[model samples]
Target: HKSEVAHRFKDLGEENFKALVLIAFAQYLQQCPFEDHVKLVNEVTEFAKTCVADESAENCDKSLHTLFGDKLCTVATLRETYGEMADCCAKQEPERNECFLQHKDDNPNLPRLVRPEVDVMCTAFHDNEETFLKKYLYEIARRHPYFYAPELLFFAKRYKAAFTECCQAADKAACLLPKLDELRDEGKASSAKQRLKCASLQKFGERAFKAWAVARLSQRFPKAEFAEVSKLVTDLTKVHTECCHGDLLECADDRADLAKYICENQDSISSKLKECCEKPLLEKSHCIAEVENDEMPADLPSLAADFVESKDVCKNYAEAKDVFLGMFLYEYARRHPDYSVVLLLRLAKTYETTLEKCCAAADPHECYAKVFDEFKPLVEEPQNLIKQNCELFEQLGEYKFQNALLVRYTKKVPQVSTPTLVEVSRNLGKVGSKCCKHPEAKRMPCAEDYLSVVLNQLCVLHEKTPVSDRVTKCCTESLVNRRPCFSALEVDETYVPKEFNAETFTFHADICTLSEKERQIKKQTALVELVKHKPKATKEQLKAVMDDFAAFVEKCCKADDKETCFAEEGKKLVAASQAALG
Candidate 1:
């Protein structure tokens, strides 16, 4: 039986050998009465080797560094320890397994310390070897709770030799040099089947190690309270400082930068973080996580300042005008379903300029208030303002056919509430309709320069003046006749249109009393012409026609000095009279 066992085990490498011993011990602990324990062990080890050997050799060593927290042993030490344990066992049936179990307490192959207090382990290793070895194997019952118990245990032999070498060294800083050599040797010696155990134990720098451990703790006790979890951090910090050389200083530096940036911008950061955290559940979690990643700008306020000062600020402003303005107003209207188009239009037109000026101001809010005062009054009952403005603009559109009529009539009307100059563009449609037309001809597309001149020069002045008799003379002057009128208004502060500008009331009468007389003369001429053409017609019919014409004149032609009402209803009356005659 011994000869056969040797043949089967001869080529099995150190990793496979140690693995077999662990398998046998596991079965023994479970009280499985296997008749051939060696065969079962071999079978399990062979299966594990075939399945995982390729990846285990390369990855196992790095993994062990994280696991053990120190580079202490190799596969050679593990296999040699397992050989001694197997040799010490009895040659009998169940008695042989019991014999192996009896020596398990004195297992020289165990890890240096199972529940290692990093500081205590480092202290013991530096002081007395005997005390360190005894302390390392003292708590076997509590130590070997997991599957790789014997594998970790095997590290004890090699670590003892490494520690002994470090103690004998003359130069103290050279202590880590020997360990580094041992690390290289292990990697060189490892094969797919001869992989090392505890490979991850010594892997991380100080911060990496702490974070690694903390993450494991979090995974292990997922439902643990944050207060409890924070205690683990305190425990880990001491261990890292005293026991581990500061490999995690890189991560420490990272944290320092993060803390500094947050402190510098705390005011804004706190407010933004509060808003982020108050978001709905999943979104709040994501927001908090993003902030925790430590990418916030150190000088956040500078970005806005830089943008304001940029030469491209005005360029950006011009670029957004066409579509962005329309888009914002549309969205505004959708959100405020009850709001008036007048309000939306006002906001759309003013906001761009408001932001432009406000961007330059040190206090943006104050700047906005200064520019925003004009429309502020309209906000109280926007519905009524909307109705009033709509009717006013509608009247302006009707007057567009006769620009003279529009300018004259608007001058005479009482403008109780005049909007600011900036607010004039809010009524673009009405302004365009009136100003884009010829007084005696049809409406046409005016050039942008012409519109600009009209808007800036004419509309600007009109909006500033309140509606009264004083404003009427200046505002109603025809475009050709308004050169001196505009010049006087701008250059002379006290210049008011003369109460009677024309010599006598001849030219003035044309605009005043004479204008009314001409309209009456035209009406009488039409009445007499109807009489001559329809002389053969009965008296009742002529009277009926005259009565209809009179009613039309009453609704369409009535204009008092106090109130002006004029629309294009005179032609319609003439057409009706022609149709009546036919």
Candidate 2:
């Protein structure tokens, strides 16, 4: 825990390795108010030095106990910390502090004092300011032993401010109680931040710890100068004064308007953040949260450690699938700063899919044990099919050649609005057809990168929903290998693409003169959708109906009276198709 607490901020001193409180004084307080642990160690070291001069062993013990007459911990916890190295007092002077520092004991349980009643408290402050403030700071510091001095100072300063203002006022309770309540909330917020720092560092090492610190400081002052940032980071370094025992923080990021800051000062950030900011408000926080942990490569836990390897994980999931996998998602996500939320979500979906099939099989545990073995191959299948799909598109026509996507991708990923999927299939189809234009040997690579952009946006858009779950299965796979997850999914043979009233046909003449390739892709999308909905319609029957709509397009473009041609004829055409199709 000492290694956990006081490892990185500074070097160990030969005279005495660093006292945790030395950091407290350096960063947080210019003038001391409370018991300084460094001073305690220094005074004890000097007292022990004089005891060695006084001679006999029992005499040394008496003097050491007397120093306890001077002052730390529930005596046993502090003395227990010293008890491990009690023989250091018999050694030379300089070595004493180092021995004590090295033998720092960590007892997990801590002493805590609740806030006193508000009315009597003002008089307590008047009786003795220094001792009163001591109790105030100590109460918080003891309960949360791992908090650094800077946070302690921060806690105390505002507390002192609130107390001074209220104690001076005529209405003490009126001023004090509300101020105290807000401080308590603020304390909770800061305590949450403290745990976030420790959990990040203790798990991923200093890399993620500093990464979170950088993010927090940047979040606090998005426009701070580098020097100002250093000043604050210096405070953070001071805050590492304590780390006793604790769990990781929850992932409820409560920063204020980070989207506003990120989008506002996007140039200082990254292009990825720029793209995230451009999305709708529903997606804004999710996008930003999911962005690669600022593109730094992290050494995450092993893949085996990432998931449940237990023999009956299926049972664990069936009973508590939401909570069980929910914990995995949050834990796996932080260590993997490089993974997007969609990628993480994909892995979560994959586990559930595998567990479902395996659990129902003849031998559930055997199937569960083999789950991860299927994972690598599962990732490959979708990827292989993506290349195969695009190659088919390369040889076939763009109109419907491999636009096989429009129906299944629409109904399967119905979380995305239907009209959007209509264009996406066309867009990816265009990528496949145009990849032949890449450097002769680079066609597949171009197809892969280009099509990746299409699906990446798909992952980015459409709030991840609970509809029958593409990209999801493969995205959760190994980061680099399986961007191809979009190809493997479950769409029912019976389900039709859902209908929407989101203005499929705008009553504007400008669209008549718009990009024709765009117009044609949209038209083909409409045809595919109509066929998907009316599965029983014959090809000749559908084409004849489409020809009716096409000729109407022809006449509407030529007619000077476009309004009546489109408005009246458009509904009539749609109605006629409905009338004709099965």
Candidate 3:
């Protein structure tokens, strides 16, 4: 009996003989299905028989150690053989086949078979389908962990004969993989941790989920058109990739993290779809509004209340207001744009008072709930009486009259810097949020008086100061916030060298690369700065040094001497200017 059991491996070549032993070791340790062990031994035996040209040759040795060396069994070789075995098994049932295809790289532990191994085991289920289903649904999913309910149903449908044959072993209370409806129901009720185990085992990625979601969306929104739906799905998938790149399926802690990522980026995701659908006038506004609401926050009520509580007493609202108010306020405003601003300001003022009152209340939600209830009638707008005064706004030319608020006392324009511009915009945003309660007007251009003063001051300073010091000063000021105003000027011809220096040069070196015209312009500006600083320099003296100044730059500026690159170049320019003046 031992010889009979062992003879099958003898002709299998030395390497394959060892491979067979390692496979058996793995099978025994993993406690693989008996059918799986039997099938592999037979297949491997058939394969080994190919290694020998003659089965009955005189004086032939067919032991595994004789045919194969010690290199036959290794971690790498085992994995390769296991992978092959798993692949071979998976081809038995479409469900197991798809599951293996999806999670080919998961599960390398001795307790679980992966890929073809799963396929083979699932195929062998025809012999005792009930026990096999029970084993995978409970034991295998717990140990090796890959069968999701969706793919399992494929086997239930495709292998009816096997399912019936296996039914005799099924326990009434036990979760059955073949009971497609029951599995789905249980999966739906499963905890987040359980769901994640299923997902992780499947090795699900955003691409697969996106495809799954997009297919469902197409069915749900048949009128939206496939191209538009696909684009929206693509945009959402990009957001998913950015928000949770490697956290796909098995890569993260919980399935909820994936859900949380989708929720957080939902507004941005929906906006892409909304923008696409809103292009035409026929039901454009309604269609767009509908599209925007496609993804409501999973925690909408909490978010709304937080939005209300955060907006008390003129506290500046940041970009978060878009989420807090944009979710609720924009709907009414779309219908009543003119009157909505006036109505909102009144509502906000009343809410602020209510919030202040609730600070001492036993339960703030009750107080806030009462306040929100009182405002509902006004917002719902049955007859919609309040009117828009367009005539009042028309008198201001480009600037519309937003409420009665007016900016006071203009400061003389100071030099423009990216930092200053950003500071001014934020300040404007704050002031606009608190005071300019205008639906008809925009807030950005309202800061022009402030912007103008700043711009004029910058131009004046450029006329008067060392361009180098100004560039360094401006860059240092804006570096913290990464202001964009400097981004435009950083590449401008006359500003390139002015934008140069240790910090800006290193930071913006790629964009700051100069053209011949810009370099020449900067050189001329430097020459003027040199002359301006030395008032004693005559025009004739400056002209005399200009030629020599050009030669020094051509030589020293292009050289690797950082020590003299600036100092030496600057020193000569000043000396030449002085000599010309003398």
Candidate 4:
């Protein structure tokens, strides 16, 4: 048996050998972490021999670097260890002379690490980074939880370089594809297969992607970075086809340059990541919808990859949009009797709506339904892993979407709360805020996703705002209209100065009036005594003083002056010098 070769490969054979071979390659390459010499060249050579196509080999090489990106530190102990492993794995011999004829003498222990010079070197490294980090946020973290689990809160801030490098790599790869194809033989069927095979082999370039995704995505920061990283990583998922289709390549220098570029522009990358997350989930859902409809040019996988590269790829999948999807599904389940297969299939496709397509990153409803469907059978037998994962999906849409790691969804069942109209408004406002930041929030798509509790919350909150306002107004009007009327009266209080002489002092009470803005200003200024050491007046005292002033105004204004005074006061202090107080 296959167990004769290795424990991991024992279960893998002919039917699944393709997968096993890839897995083996990953394991072997992963061991590079233990080597002390530059292992990239040796690993690439070994990979080239096993890989099915030229395109796959190049992509895989770049991805390998990304997975073990920590080793990029030329002086790191990890780098030295990986370098030694590379030397060990290579059997002290160069695998092929065609690629490295001139550099044979320089092949001391490891492949040379330097800045990207030529296009191939640059693009490969970047494309690899773009794919792995962007595609699997949790796969990376779960695989190597400790090394990268530190910054899990805001992994985007720490992993901005990886994301930017992926973008640059993709751009570079796009430019080099036509040139790389020149090396392939158009006349040979074998060559075409070789290219296709290379593409397949590229998929197996897992070690680099796995390690890097894990290391970079585990950083803890704020939701701001979470929002950005999520956007950037998701962006790469859109460009995945290009990377997989032999459109990108990178050499040692190029890989180094990509890494350096990430290092140099860390701040900008972080900013972009934050910008991506801050976008509204509604807009993001719309963006996803646009992509689904092919209205948007970007693909979801590539979009996701973009976020991963920037280290902003969301780890948790439990977004508000997903809640709506779940609720919709639950409603559907309640209405349907048989849970028919055709219906299930249609329900599964809710993510393909215009909103999901346009967003081009993630579809909470669609994605959740798909995973839940997968979990359905397992729920029957109910293994620990299956039960826990399903439960997690219930809480956070997907466990990977959250920043936390090693979480057991089995233990936590999210509580259902019926948010009030006001709270719902607040949450929707938050959703709006998120949309501005992340650009993935959308309403229509969310509404259609019955299972999406969040969507339900948002819509209810929105609908209630106008309704609540109307109710409040109705109540106020009813109270005012029911009040009784009364007749007006006038009263006056006169005061005399201590020394009453020819020049006698007299005071009369009256009212004051003013325009809304002027009245507010006067009240603010006059009520507070900056004019003198203001006495600490109570509410009653303040009311008495205002009443005395009104009395004086009532007594002083003559009939003709009353009109003039009312006009002046209306524009200034606002007084009603009428019969009510006579």
Candidate 5:
């Protein structure tokens, strides 16, 4: 309807004109990967040519309307930086891609551009599903244009899924808001990690970081040939070196190329990646993101095959220098799929640290005492805590695990915001799958690596702007002291606040459709919320309250009028919590 009289923007300027065309192709590729790709490239190009050469603005408007919809031109043209394609638009090709890439990475801050609320979005979806979906695709793509095509599509896909799920629900906000919030949190977390990864690369020097990358990938793709492993490391190193320090369009393109690499080389890499690779690009990206580490190929050299003799170690190492450490890592990595690349690399660099002191000794060979015998204990203590946490996570499931983390942090660091507390708990909840799922040789070491990542993330997040005494102290401590200091932090009982209200969640009929594990988690989640809301409520009183809620759920699940049954139970549960509050 709006397209009828919407502003038919003309040649916004040669640069703006060009940006319009390029951005259209980008949006098209991102939103429509399955559609004809070559058609888009040619079609958008001619639109630019005729608009300027033939001197007709109509082609420009029609071309944009097809991609950005009726509203985009008026909106973007106004927000136009006119200003220097000062960003990416004026820069040379391929080079400009990287610049545009960084520009899009800042999607969260769109100057003053507001996201359409769910009510608006739901209505828009109803009116025209594809138009609105593409519009959403356009919105995100416009801001973070340099992000991977498959990645942007993830949000757009998530957008449709959430709206579709929520639109028909009895309480729209209940289902919708969280799904939206999850998407935001996901984007926030992803960006944070990218920055954190690049920053770590900058701090750790390329030679050291590359060794770690090689160790990590070698484990992930154990079936991959050493030549393939080397190329992956080199390509990844370039991404960090260039992406961290310099240009950006190359942003998604490099990854786009790599994503295709994994898809094509499934036979050479782990077959686990095949499922994700077989899917279309958007679905494939999300699938690949969630894939767990695969087992090392049996064909690889055995751990004992490369071990240098104890007395010969110092002599061989000094002769070959870094190559000695590389060989050390290959054995360390292939032998223990449990060991994280970070730990593998740590052991490598520690070899350097250990030898620098030892090799300087009166008898260099005699000074060479490996740290692994003693090191395992240090790793064991911290690594055990992760296993305990993951076991607890698996037993109670995510709801209970999340609740436990929330309670622990709320008591231990009471000054933080509730949102901050909740997100932290949610973030760490990933340990359930990574640490405990692969229980044998892979399990504990995976936990070890994950724990390190968590701590590293903690340092990465607040090292510069620390929030707590523990955070500041731990951040400053040597790696030797860091883990213990973190473990030793006392509960922050100094601050007090009223009303520790938590969301008292209610269920929909779909709860009946969940698996036993899933349903049990929801039940516990409700009980936890009830307890948090009525903090002064006694344990015995809450037990009775939860028992009643449980019976109501069972009876409701069996009822024909499940909706009415669940509806009544929610009111009953509320009163029970209030009664317990006394």
Candidate 6:
């Protein structure tokens, strides 16, 4: 409706056209604005004066066609009708029976029931509701798109928030008018004196919006139990209105007697109570029943008890299911801080009742299983969420670490981007799977897993050796296999190539006895030529290589050091080569 009308008015200009005026006036009947209330009162007063002037005019044409078809026009009837209707509304509350009974009938040419009178009534309310909806929608869109998505997504997330907030605010103002009207009608039907005290009470409590709702509901259900409900509603409003507007209106104090009367005649006020509950746990039995297939939902009785005991907390967080449950537990703990060393036994029977009533409803179709099926993977499982993230990071980290190994062993520089950790902390609620609880549980291997593999491979490499004859198989396999070896083997760029570079012609010539000295000298010359293309190594990098070379010397000559060294003598020879290179 808003879109269609906004588009309809898109091309209008400020021309003094009578047809447009009629259309604008008619359009206003369906909506009310705060401005319209003030405008109507002023317009009607001026319209009354216009009617007086028209009555004294030389001639007047009353017909729409005659006025538009080259005849002098007058709106004496329109002016008179507006003034009468406005007068009728002004006297409506103070004069009560006199206003509608007498003056309401005075506008006979055009009844106030027509579109013109409706325009005055509707415009004020329509504009206010529209403004309310706009402010509400603005709040939802303010945060991250994740918080409140736009388009269909916004409706998906924020529809309830908007509905709840609007209902809460509107409920405070709406739903009291029928009580006021009932007071008026009863005063007319019986005696005005009997209703005076009640009418005054309702008149003070009843608001514009409440009157509108009453009018609407009365029109819909003419013969419904409106009188009984209205009286009860009036009494409840007398209490609730004080609760709402006391600071502003200096509204009457809320009497416990009135509250007790309202609570006794609850049906009238139940509509407001329905909204007060916020999002109704509609068919909650269906949801609670699902988780009880294995065992009764032990949480139910405590929830109800908490809801009953901690009224403020429940009301404040009525919309938050988590907070509602948490508040229940919090209230329970506050009362019985040490209810038990294990479980609160007294609460168990209550739990059983709640489980039967809420969670363990008989029908399987209505159980927690059905509801949990939808919400569990979506809301419950953190492992389900971060497990993928954890695995992905592990794979990506392994990929990156392998790349880093290449940079180490091939004597090639590499860059490392810090892998994003799987966000599995406070946000991921449960980490139970990570902890093992068995009495015989042994410590598990960490990322240093391949150390044994490296040592064993190094042992295999050095089994045959004449200082320089031992095979450099570990480095060969590591650089070729691209395994987790270089961090343990050597990291300084100068020694890594002598160890792990797959292009072994340089190393074979440098160390292999199988190759003749002339070939080795040729290879040396080739290597020296390759050195012409070498980058200017940093001082720290050069120093690292020299330091590694010294370590290799210590490992080789110091025979008692027995971990993954090739031969004691081979390490010595490699140290000699390292010294030569430095």
TM-score per prediction, in order, is: 0.17, 0.32, 0.19, 0.17, 0.61, 0.14
lDDT (Cα, tens digit) per residue for candidate 1, span 1-582: 222223223434544454434443432232222333334445545543543444334223332112112111122233354554444332443344334444443223434423444344456787776446533332332233222232233444566666666655665336745564564334223211111112212332343334333433332333333334345445545533422221222222333343344334444334345554444321332243334212223332332232334444445556765334433433333333233333444454566667667757776655555444554654444334334434554565432222222222222331312222212232344344543443311121122212334433444355575444444554554322232343343222232332321122111112233454365444433433343344344456666766775675565434553122222454455566557766
Query: Which stretches of candidate 5 lie above 4 Å from their native place?
Result: 1-123, 142-146, 154-189, 224-228, 243-248, 256-294, 297-305, 308-311, 394-407, 410-419, 429-466, 473-485, 488-582
Of 1 and 6, the candidate ahead on TM-score is 1
lDDT by residue for model 3 (409-448), tens: 0111122333433333333333334323434333222222
lDDT of 5 by residue, 202-225 (tens): 655678677877787766676666
The model with the greatest TM-score is 5
Prediction 3 global C-alpha lDDT: 0.38
Please give the clash total of every predicted structure, in order.
24, 4, 21, 171, 4, 18
* TM-score result, candidate 1: 0.17
Candidate 6, residue 90: how far the Cα is off, in Å: 64
* Deviation (Å) of 407 in candidate 1: 10
Cα displacement (Å) at residue 19, model 5: 14
Please report, in order, the local distance difference test score of every candidate based on alpha carbons.
0.38, 0.52, 0.38, 0.30, 0.59, 0.31
Across 1-582, the per-residue lDDT of candidate 2 in tens digits comes to: 122112121222223222323332222221222455445545545544444444443335443222332233223343344354445555553354344435433233444456788767888888887567655554455455445444455567678898899988998888998899888855755555555445434544543344334434433333334444444444444334233221001111121144555577666655457677877543454466456334422454554543555565666677876556654544444444333333445565677787778878997666656555655664445445545765666676776653465654654554555567776777767666666455443343345435555554555454354233445555444433445445446664656544633255323455488777677666765655565556555557866876787788888888687767778777777777766753
Ranking by TM-score: 5, 2, 3, 1, 4, 6
Candidate 5: deviation at residue 117, Å? Answer: 8.8
lDDT, residue 91, candidate 6: 35
Clashes of 6: 18
Error of 4 at 322 (Å): 27
Worst 10 residues of 6 by lDDT: 420-429
Name the better of 3 and 5 by TM-score. Answer: 5
Displacement of the residue 326 alpha carbon in candidate 5, Å = 2.6
RMSD of 6: 30.9
Better-scoring candidate (TM-score), 4 or 5: 5
lDDT, candidate 4, 1-582, per-residue tens: 111222212222322322222222222333233222224434433443444333343334333323222222322343354444333232222222112222222113334233344464455546685344322333222232121111221242234343344345546545444343432212122223223323323543432232222212212111113334343333333233333332112222232333343334445443323333333321222122122211111222332233223232123222454433333333333222223222322443343243254345554333323333443552232133323433443464321222121111101111112123223323333323322232122322222122223332333344455433322332233111211100011111121112212111122113235554353333333322211111233335445555654554564464455655544453333223112222
State the displacement of the C-alpha of residue 9, model 1, in Å, after optimal TM-score superposition.
89
